[PDB]
């Protein structure tokens, strides 16, 4: 296959629409890995997505330690 990235042209890798942690950095936010029996090039995932409940009169207090 052929793929056009801002770092050039990539031949031999198939582009997928998922996102994983980077294994081999190619550049411009594009990384590559060996998975599935094949080589897949993907876009980096910064991390999990979270939201915090904020209001005038709410607090969170811990009840245990490690």
């Amino acid at each position: 296959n052929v793929f056009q990235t801002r770092a050039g042209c990539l031949i031999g890798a198939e582009y997928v629409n998922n996102s994983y942690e980077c294994d081999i950095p190619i550049g411009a936010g594009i990384c590559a890995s060996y998975q599935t029996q094949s080589i897949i090039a993907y876009t980096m995932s910064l991390g999990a997505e979270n939201s915090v409940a904020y209001s005038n009169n709410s607090i969170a207090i811990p009840t245990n330690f490690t």
């Binding site: 801002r6 910064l46 991390g47 997505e49 939201s51 915090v52 709410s58 607090i59 811990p62």
Partner: protein, 411 residues
Amino acid sequence: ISVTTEILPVSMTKTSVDCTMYICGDSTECSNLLLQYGSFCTQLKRALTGIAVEQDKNTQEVFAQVKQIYKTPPIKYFGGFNFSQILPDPSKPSKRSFIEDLLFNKVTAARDLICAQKFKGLTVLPPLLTDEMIAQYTSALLAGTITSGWTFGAGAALQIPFAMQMAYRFNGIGVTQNVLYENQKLIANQFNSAIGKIQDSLSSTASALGKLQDVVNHNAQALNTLVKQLSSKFGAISSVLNDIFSRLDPPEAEVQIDRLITGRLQSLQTYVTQQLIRAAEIRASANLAATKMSECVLGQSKRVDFCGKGYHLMSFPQSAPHGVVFLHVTYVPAQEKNFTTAPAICHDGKAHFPREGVFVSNGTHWFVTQRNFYEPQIITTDNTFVSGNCDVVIGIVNNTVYDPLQPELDS
């Protein structure tokens, strides 16, 4: 309440050099002759690759410090503080803020210089992280510090109202919470005015980003001198080698070629050494920036003149071309007044020392007050402790102490 700006460089520009094109051009005879000098280019490639990976390591260490990406809730009330200029703006396609846009715009037929340098074997590689990812990291850090506080730097993010967070920080610097709870509106107005002044200064002044511009200028000057070195004879007949080959016989052409090769190799060596030194300095700056990010943004620092000039309250990060910008919010006293003091109070033949504050007098009476704010109170046994008689301490004075129990005995 004061807001101060700090600028720190983080990374550099990644470069790659092609030996054969730079030295021998498009001549095959020089290409054949070059092999005699051994392995002089694998070392150069290794050094440049090391610098290139070092830059990405620097950026990742500085910015990637949060495991989860947070978002601010749609409601934008934070106790009167605006924050609308430093939070992401969804309208623009870059998902950036006003100050970030100003900072990026601040630092900047015919053929472009980049193409001309590329056509001689000097190329620039792209960084691993785009600007959007750095913006997302900055937004996540801002959301975490606004909503959770410093709890997200040591575990899970626990929500807390902004006013109570400010009260905790005031307690940290050494002032009680009632000051904030009674001057919330004034503090919010001061913060908004300071942010507006920062806006005006950024929009007007164009010389506050010197360090990143100096980095860019140094890189440009190094490339310029490397390119200019190609047009010097080094003691030969001419710089152009085809004329040397055509004009005169091989016996002296070999000497001329050797002179040119030695000169160009020496120039490349000098360039690599200067690049190594500059990269070491940039890495030191990046380490300092990472430490500052971990100490001033994810917590409160007691160190003096580290996270701002004054008493530190908190800080905010923003991105910049090849660098980071810190907005420090700090506390400074004003409108001071003179008073008369004593070290202890001798009452009932016993010495009395304050528990938290200091003793003051306004001319006739005596009070106890906190250190960083004028708030007098009557000297009682609840805010005083006794140790020994009053004939040893130098400078003790006479007064009376109030006991909150005897009034209740008779009433």
